[PDB]
C-alpha cells in the first residue's frame, strides 16, 4: 500500500555528488564515443551505491523481515537520469562475469523501488539504454531476485516501464501455460488473498495467452463471491478492471 521496498534507505551524500557532477559535466564534449578518471572517489560500485544512500552489503528480497514493507523513511534521494549516468561507467564490457552480474542486479534493484520510480522523468531514455546492454533471456533468467510465485506486486512495477517484457517474463514464471495460469488463480482465490490477486490480474493481460476481447471465467469466480457487500476494499475494483478489459479489441 505505502510500503514497497524503498531500495534507498539512508540519506544521500549530496555535497560529494554535486562535486562529482561538477567534474562530470565537462566529460561530455571531450569524449562521448571512446571510454575514466573523472570519478575516483567511488573506486568500486559499492562505494557509489553507498554515496547514493544505500547501506552496507548493498542485493536480494527474501521476505523474512517484512523487507518489502519498509515505511516512508523520508530521506531525500538524487535525480534518476544522472543516477543512471554515473552507474553506466562501471559497465566493463570485457571483464569478469561476476561483476557484470552484480551490476545488473544493482540496476534491477534500483529500478523497482518507490523513491526512484515516483520521481521518474517522462523522457525514459537512459533505462532503455541500460536495457539493451543485456538480452531478454539473461535479463529474465538472472532477473530480479523477487519470488516469482508469491509476489506479482513487483511484476506490475516491472511491466509498467518495460512493456515488451510482457511476453518475456510470463514464460519464465509459468514455465500448458494457459491452464497453469488458472491453477495459479485458484491458489490465490482459495486463499483469501484479495490483495495479491489484483496485480496478478493487471500483469499478464494482453499477452499471447490471455488476450483482451469478449472471449476465461475469472469474472465468474469474482461474481460468485460478492454477497458480503462489506467483504474487502480490493474486490470491487478487480471486477471493474475485469469487465473493462473484456470490452476492448
Amino acid at each position: 500500500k505505502y510500503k514497497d521496498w524503498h531500495f534507498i534507505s539512508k540519506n544521500c551524500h549530496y555535497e560529494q555528488l554535486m562535486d562529482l557532477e561538477m567534474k562530470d559535466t565537462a566529460y561530455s564534449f571531450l569524449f562521448g564515443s571512446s571510454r575514466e578518471f573523472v570519478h575516483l572517489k567511488c573506486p568500486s560500485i559499492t562505494n557509489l551505491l553507498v554515496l547514493f544512500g544505500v547501506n552496507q552489503e548493498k542485493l536480494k528480497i527474501n521476505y523474512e523481515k517484512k523487507e518489502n514493507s519498509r515505511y516512508d523513511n523520508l530521506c531525500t534521494i538524487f535525480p534518476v537520469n544522472k543516477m543512471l549516468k554515473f552507474l553506466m561507467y562501471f559497465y566493463s564490457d570485457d571483464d569478469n562475469d561476476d561483476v557484470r552480474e552484480f551490476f545488473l542486479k544493482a540496476f534491477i534493484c534500483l529500478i523497482l523501488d518507490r523513491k526512484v520510480f515516483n520521481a521518474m522523468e517522462s523522457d525514459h531514455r537512459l533505462c532503455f539504454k541500460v536495457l539493451e546492454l543485456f538480452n531478454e533471456a539473461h535479463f529474465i533468467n538472472s532477473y530480479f531476485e523477487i519470488v516469482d510465485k508469491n509476489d506479482f506486486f513487483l511484476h506490475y512495477r516491472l511491466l509498467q516501464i518495460f512493456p515488451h517484457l510482457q511476453s518475456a517474463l510470463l514464460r519464465r514464471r509459468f514455465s500448458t501455460i494457459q491452464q497453469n495460469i488458472i491453477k495459479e488463480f485458484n491458489e490465490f482465490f482459495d486463499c483469501k488473498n484479495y490483495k495479491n490477486l489484483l496485480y496478478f490480474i493487471l500483469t499478464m493481460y494482453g499477452s499471447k495467452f490471455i488476450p483482451f476481447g469478449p472471449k476465461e471465467y475469472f469474472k465468474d469466480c469474482i461474481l460468485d463471491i460478492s454477497n458480503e457487500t462489506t467483504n474487502d476494499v480490493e474486490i470491487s475494483i478487480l471486477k471493474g478492471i475485469l469487465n473493462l478489459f473484456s470490452k476492448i479489441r
Binding site: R114, S122, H124
Partner: protein
C-alpha cells in the same frame, strides 16, 4: 475534411466513445489504464481522441505538490502507486516519440495519420490573443458541457484568454531558476515538460504546413504564406515591436548577464491559483543542484530559440517576413549582445555546450560566430568562419590570422585593476571558438592543424606568463589542454 482530417473507422469509434464516456464519469484512472494496458503489446496503436488530448493537457497541470487532497479524493486506492498527473505526462511523451517516427514498419499508416490529425486538431485550438466544436459527428463528446476538470479550468480555454499565452512562457522561464520549492516546482514538473511538448508540436505542425499548405508559387507570395503559419501566430504572442531588445529579453528572464533593461521586469503571475504554494501533507524528495537547475532551463531556452530561426531560414533572401516583422539578422546580433554579456560563465557554457549537437545545428554555429564578432569588438574585425564551414584550410588560415591579430591573448598592461572582468571576457570568447571547433570536427568527420596547434601553444604560453607577471597565485584560463586532447 479541410486538411489533414481523417474519417473514422468503426473499430476506433468504439474506443473514442468509450474513453470519452469514461472521462464524462469523472473516473480518469480507468481512462489512463486503457491507454497503458495496450501500449507496447500489439500493433494496434490505440490513439487518444483530440478532446481526450485536451484533458491530459489538464491532468498534467495538476500535481500533488499544491493539490494533494484532491488527487487522493479522486481515487483513494492509487492502484499503480502514482499520481494522475505524472501518468498523464508519461502517456503524452510516450505517444510523442511515436509521433516523430512515422515508423510504419510495425504500425499502420491509417492509424499514424489519425494520430497526427488528432494532435494537430488538439493544437489548432490554441489561438493566442494579445492584451467547443467537435469536427467529428459519429459520437457526442465531452467538454461540450464540461468546462472544469477537478478545480483547474482547462488549457485551450485558458491560454486563449487575453494576456495569458504571453504570461505562461514568462512564468516557466522565470521560475526555472528558483530556490524556493513552491516556485521551482511550478516550472519543473508542470510547465517545463508541457512547454517542451508545445514547442515540438508547433515545430511539427509547421513541418506539415510547409508541404501541404502551394508548389510552384511566387516568392513574394510564398513569403506571405508564412505570416499565417502556425509558428508565426505562435510568436505573435510577443506583444512588442522591439524584438531587437525584447525577444533577447524574454528568453533570458531570470538569467543575470548584465541586464540593462531600465524598463521594469515583466509582471509574472501563476496561471492557476495556488500554484506557488506547497501543500502541508507532501514533502519534496528530489534534491536538484543549482547547476542541474540551470542545465535543464537553458536546454529549453535554446530549444525555444531553435524554433525561431527555423521559420527565419524559410524566409527568402529577397523579402522579409510580415506578421512578426522580424529579420534573420537582428536576432543573431540580439541573441549575441546578451550571450557574450554573461556573468556566470557556467551558464555561458551550458547554453553554448549543447547535448543535442546534430539536431541543434544551423543556428548554434551562427550565434557562436555572432558572439565572437561582438566580443572581438571589445577585445580587438571581420569574422567569416561560418561561410567556411566545409573546408578546414579556410578555418586554419582564419584562426591563425585571428590569433596573430591579438584577439585570443590578454589585453594591455592593465592587469589587476580590472582582472576579474577581463579574465571572464577572455574565457567567454574562447568557448565560442571551442564550440565552432567542435562543430568543425563533427561536420568534417593536416599541417595546418599543427600550425594552429603551435600558434595556440604560443598564445597560451603568453597568457600564462602574463598571469605570472601579474603576481597571481593561480593559473589563467588555459585553452590548449582541451584542444590537444580533442584532436588527439
Amino acid at each position: 475534411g479541410a486538411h489533414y482530417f481523417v474519417e473514422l473507422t468503426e473499430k476506433h469509434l468504439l474506443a473514442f466513445e468509450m474513453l470519452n464516456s469514461m472521462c464524462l464519469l469523472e473516473n480518469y484512472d480507468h481512462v489512463l489504464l486503457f491507454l497503458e494496458c495496450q501500449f507496447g503489446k500489439s500493433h494496434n496503436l490505440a490513439v487518444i481522441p483530440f478532446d481526450i488530448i485536451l484533458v491530459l493537457f489538464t491532468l498534467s497541470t495538476l500535481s500533488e505538490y499544491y493539490k494533494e487532497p484532491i488527487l487522493r479524493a479522486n481515487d483513494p486506492y492509487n492502484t499503480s502507486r502514482e499520481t494522475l498527473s505524472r501518468r498523464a505526462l508519461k502517456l503524452l511523451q510516450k505517444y510523442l516519440a511515436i509521433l516523430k517516427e512515422f515508423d510504419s514498419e510495425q504500425y499502420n499508416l491509417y492509424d499514424l495519420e489519425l494520430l497526427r490529425c488528432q494532435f494537430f486538431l488538439a493544437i489548432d485550438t490554441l489561438t493566442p490573443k494579445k492584451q467547443f466544436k467537435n469536427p467529428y459527428r459519429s459520437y457526442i463528446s465531452c467538454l461540450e458541457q464540461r468546462n472544469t476538470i477537478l478545480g483547474n479550468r482547462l488549457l485551450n480555454l485558458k491560454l486563449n484568454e487575453p494576456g495569458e499565452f504571453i504570461n505562461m512562457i514568462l512564468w516557466t522561464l522565470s521560475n526555472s531558476l528558483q530556490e524556493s520549492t513552491p516556485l521551482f516546482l511550478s516550472s519543473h514538473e508542470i510547465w517545463m515538460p508541457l512547454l517542451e511538448i508545445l514547442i515540438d508540436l508547433f515545430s511539427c505542425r509547421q513541418d506539415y504546413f510547409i508541404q501541404h499548405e502551394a508548389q510552384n508559387v511566387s516568392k513574394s507570395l510564398f513569403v506571405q504564406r508564412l505570416s499565417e503559419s502556425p509558428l508565426a501566430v505562435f510568436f505573435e504572442s510577443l506583444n512588442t515591436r522591439n524584438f531587437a531588445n525584447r525577444f533577447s529579453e524574454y528568453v533570458f528572464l531570470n538569467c543575470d548577464y548584465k541586464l540593462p533593461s531600465d524598463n521594469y521586469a515583466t509582471p509574472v503571475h501563476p496561471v492557476y491559483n495556488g500554484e506557488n504554494t506547497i501543500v502541508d501533507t507532501y514533502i519534496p524528495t528530489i534534491k536538484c543542484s543549482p547547476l542541474y537547475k540551470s542545465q535543464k532551463s537553458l536546454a529549453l531556452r535554446r530549444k525555444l530559440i531553435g524554433s525561431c530561426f527555423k521559420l527565419l531560414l524559410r524566409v527568402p533572401d529577397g523579402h522579409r517576413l510580415i506578421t512578426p516583422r522580424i529579420v534573420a539578422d537582428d536576432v543573431i546580433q540580439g541573441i549575441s549582445r546578451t550571450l557574450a554579456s554573461f556573468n556566470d560563465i557556467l551558464q555561458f557554457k551550458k547554453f553554448f555546450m549543447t547535448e543535442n549537437l546534430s539536431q541543434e545545428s544551423y543556428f548554434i554555429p551562427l550565434l557562436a560566430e555572432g558572439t565572437l564578432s561582438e566580443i572581438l569588438k571589445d577585445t580587438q574585425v571581420i569574422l567569416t568562419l561560418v561561410e567556411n564551414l566545409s573546408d578546414g584550410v579556410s578555418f586554419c588560415n582564419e584562426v591563425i590570422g585571428l590569433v596573430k591579430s591579438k584577439c585570443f591573448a590578454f589585453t594591455e598592461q592593465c592587469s589587476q585593476a580590472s582582472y576579474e572582468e577581463a579574465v571572464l571576457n577572455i574565457e567567454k570568447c574562447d568557448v565560442c571558438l571551442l564550440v565552432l571547433l567542435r562543430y568543425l570536427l563533427h561536420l568534417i568527420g593536416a599541417k595546418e592543424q599543427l600550425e594552429m596547434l603551435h600558434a595556440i601553444e604560443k598564445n597560451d604560453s603568453g597568457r600564462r606568463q602574463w598571469a605570472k607577471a601579474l603576481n597571481l597565485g593561480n593559473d589563467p584560463p588555459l585553452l590548449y589542454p582541451i584542444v590537444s586532447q580533442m584532436f588527439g
